[PDB]
């Protein structure tokens, strides 16, 4: 059946730490998906999956969006989607880390911070007006979104297949809604380092050692979400931790987003510099289907389905009609499919 | 029936032939654009596609 | 006048209470939009807009999504989108209530409640093994969504123009994801009552007398999001309130959705019966563009732009150039 597909979610979890086994068991009740979740070690919250039959599979990796800023009116940086076309054998192990959205600056259940959010308390604005930067009153900056990873365990070391970058966090004073062009890595020889962290937390990459509690962790360190700024805990009652999957935490600057290469953050505590998103990855073992594009507004996700192998028609591209179970192959350049259903006219 | 709404969300964006191939891929074989409840996502995708220089 | 549109949002606000003047002035800085926010009475939180020209306008109203359930795995019920074509005079005072998202059941700041949410606690699950009725503790239901309203005054009486219903709430046992067909109403002669409120809060309609504390309010009495059910208020500590714009109250069941007619909730405390959607409304003075569709995932919005007269010529489709009349019908 073409319609069959497996939808890996974040299992209902949120924040800097990923799901447990019970969360994923509850999330996949009365469905066709069943995963096992690592309980301890750096594989905590990573969902293993057994490929049911050898086939060509399309994998849809969607990263997670960043957190909104303190003045939570500018839109959050969206998470990146990567479509990959891979080939999979029987009993293969796919380790899937579904990214998680970075925590927002506002709203907050803390009363003082809530009064800051509604604009009645505006000490941060006075600090910006006086010192041209934030040093004392660390304002709410959004947490970085978590990357989505689909990889596998070949004889000792993980091998990445799909990485969807996570949306960077929005700074306190993000007056610009412009987003940078999306970054994709198609080569495995380029290292999967971590994002640079200044006051806020840079996003977590593929394989790098983290010495910072606020930066996001790389996948080979568990890839837990980074803590908030040290000044965000002292003389303040709020924290904006990045999501699971390398999401950096939010100081007055913006929290970096995870990826194959982690997103950056402001070296100083600039209240207006949003956190850069991560760099997505596509494996040479698979075929990239569509470019990397920012789509997601919340938690990341994974969609695995049987790829529609339709090289039988003249044009290399085709699709499945929702109305008719018959496959439809189209012709570009204003050409029209012939009556044979393969040829073009 | 499901194209005027997407046109309203998206706006006047033009696509090159290779970009038209990628357009077909997102529009038909990505579930963001298939099921009605993710059209915003779909629209977002389309927008970002037009931002790439491969799309005129 | 290239790309001149105005986008109305929740001004950064959330939860069951609308935005105030400060947050909307903060939201619309360095843009082509300036609003006033009512400070008291039924119009507290409803934004003031002055129509800049007498022209045909397209107004798109997007409701707010409901809250996720306690086992927050299934998707939230989406806010309905209504697109309309209206004719607007110079210097009209449009009144725009932007719906706010119903609060999710999980996560919560309370340690015991988060322990329930993750899975170490199963008192609700055991409770539906011993008597199958959640009444000692309370289940997890997200708040209903806040509808989106664009209206105006004649003789001091509100006149509905665009009403996009808000998303219903996700119950605890929301094992399925089915949604009822999207209800749109065009005739205004049917009064905008509220939805039924039982253990959970129904949605808040156009104008009705709401006495229940957990239910959401109609617009002509504030359209405030309701509180949680009192069973969840005491000895369970749940505060899953609704959204601004008639958002119902979260309980074991799902909170009903706002709209012109509010979304019905569960009379009993059924933890698998979700929050129903509301009824969206299109004014008789406007033109319906596309069928109403459940679209939005969070806080609703309004987009107002000048309508393009595609149908002024034989071809029904047109795309005007930014500085020149390049509508698509060749002469």
Author numbering:
A (entry chain B): 678 to 1022
B (entry chain C): 93 to 148
C (entry chain A): 678 to 1008
Which sentences from the paper describe this structure?
Here, we show based on reanalysis of the cryo-EM data deposited in EMPIAR-10930 that over half of the ALK-ALKAL2 particles in the dataset are classified into 2D and 3D classes obeying a 2:1 stoichiometry besides the originally reported structure displaying 2:2 stoichiometry. Unlike particles representing the 2:2 ALK-ALKAL2 complex, particles for the 2:1 ALK-ALKAL2 complex suffer severely from preferred orientations that resulted in cryo-EM maps displaying strong anisotropy. The combined use of Orientation Rebalancing in CryoSPARC and 3D refinement in RELION v5 with enabled Blush regularization, resulted in a final map at 3.2-Å resolution displaying an impressive improvement in isotropy, as evidenced by the 10-fold increase in the cFAR score, and overall interpretability. Most importantly, post-processing in RELION yielded a sharpened map with clear main chain connectivity and signal for most side chains, allowing complete model building of a 2:1 ALKTG-EGFL-ALKAL2 complex that includes the membrane-proximal EGFL-like domains of ALK. While the majority of the 2:1 ALKTG-EGFL-ALKAL2 cryo-EM map has a local resolution to better than 3.5-Å resolution, the C-terminal tips of the EGFL domains are only resolved at 4–4.5 Å resolution pointing to their inherent flexibility. Most importantly, though, this new structure is now the most complete ALK-ALKAL2 complex with 2:1 stoichiometry to date and agrees closely with the ALKTG-ALKAL2 with 2:1 stoichiometry reported by De Munck and colleagues featuring site 1 (ALK-ALKAL2), site 2 (ALK’-ALKAL2), and site 3 (ALK-ALK’) interaction interfaces. Accordingly, the root-mean-square deviation (r.m.s.d.) between these two structures is 1.3 Å over 675 aligned Cα-atoms. The site 2 interface present in the 2:1 ALK:ALKAL2 complex, but not in the 2:2 ALK-ALKAL2 complex, involves the α1 helix of ALKAL2 with a key histidine residue (H100) interacting with S737, Y739, and L760 of ALK’. Due to the asymmetric nature of the ALKAL2 monomer, the EGFL domain of the opposing ALK protomer (ALK’) in the 2:1 ALKTG-EGFL-ALKAL2 complex does not make any direct contacts at the “site 2” interaction with ALKAL2. As a result, the ALK’ EGFL domain is less resolved at its extremity due to increased flexibility, resulting in the absence of density for the minor β-hairpin in the cryo-EM map.
